[PDB]
Amino acid sequence: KDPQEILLNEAFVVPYGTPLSVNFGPTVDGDFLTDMPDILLELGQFKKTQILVGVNKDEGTAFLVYGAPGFSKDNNSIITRKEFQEGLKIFFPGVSEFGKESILFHYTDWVDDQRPEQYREALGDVVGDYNFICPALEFTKKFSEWGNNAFFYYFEHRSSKLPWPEWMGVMHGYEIEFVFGLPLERRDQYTKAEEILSRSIVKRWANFAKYGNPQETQNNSTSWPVFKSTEQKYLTLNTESTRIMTKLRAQQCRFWTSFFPKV
């Protein structure tokens, strides 16, 4: 077959896709991957070395405009309860009714004003916590239980040049340009504070690669503590103040990690 014909048909090999559909991805091949990876991770079979792991504040939002009803990059995407329910259908196509109600339940006990943005925000969190944040935090706990140093960050700066709308917040993919040092180029219309954040991140990544320890040691910076099961400290990355915090998304991940998999 010519390549186009393979590509054109890729989208349909699946009965129903989601916006995060991975039609063709990694498998347990007996070669690159000798067993189910959940089992390797659990039983400590992996390279012993240091890791640096992190997530952005609004991982799930990018995906809502590729299919969830009531969403648009061109308006404020205030959605109703019903639209929320329909969005869960779109993101959780093979899940029992009870599976879906349980998500609705975990994410809609409002605190508390009847804010119009309640449902729009809950859907972004749902998508981001299940698909990105809770699996990242779970890999870091399990990896670190076998003795190696790990460091965990939570990126909460929204690029001043972001072409997406405000409601989508600190989006998935939009730390990359900080890590690669784009805002160090003064000609580029990023702010002074963005220049400084990128410089500090670039230093911490570089020190991690060279020395295994993602510190910025010269400019009175906050020390990045190791992530240990038990305390679960992480470092926030932002323009205002860098903070040491504990137990990211603790209630949400208990839901995704210990209950949802049974469903």
Ligand X SMILES: *[C@@H]1O[C@H](CO[C@H]2O[C@@H](C)[C@@H](O)[C@@H](O)[C@@H]2O)[C@@H](O[C@@H]2O[C@H](CO)[C@@H](O)[C@H](O)[C@H]2NC(C)=O)[C@H](O)[C@H]1NC(C)=O
Catalytically active residues, by annotation: 59, 172
Nearest 5 degrees, angle CA 143-CA 145-CA 147?
Answer: 90
Task: Tell me the per-residue interface mask from 39 to 78 with ligand X, x by CB under 6 A, - otherwise.
Answer: ------------------------------xx-x-xxx-x
CB of 71 to ligand X, least distance (A): 7
C-beta of 203 vs 233, nearer to ligand NAG = 203
CA distance linking residue 224 with residue 218, whole number of Å: 14
Q: Are 207 and 214 in contact (CB under 8 A)?
A: yes
CB of 195 to ligand NAG, least distance (A): 8
Applying the rule CB under 8 A, the residues between 99 and 128 that interact with its own copies are 101-102, 105, 109, 111-114
Task: Pick one of its own copies, ligand X, K ion, none as the site partner of residue 75 (Cβ within 5 to 8 A by kind).
Answer: ligand X
Applying the rule CB under 5 A, the residues between 109 and 168 that interact with Cl ion are 148-149
Task: Pick one of Cl ion, its own copies, ligand X, none as the site partner of residue 74 (Cβ within 5 to 8 A by kind).
Answer: ligand X
Q: Is 258 in the site for ligand NAG (CB under 6 A)?
A: no
Q: Mention every residue, 6+ apart, whose C-beta is less than 8 A from residue 128.
A: 55, 58, 59, 60, 61, 172
Instruction: Measure CA of the first residue to CA of the last residue in the chain; give whole Å.
Output: 40
Q: Report, in angstroms and rounded to the nearest whole number, the Rg of the chain calculated over CA atoms.
A: 20
CA distance linking residue 159 with residue 190, whole number of Å: 8
Residues that bind ligand X (CB under 6 A): 69-70, 72, 74-76, 78
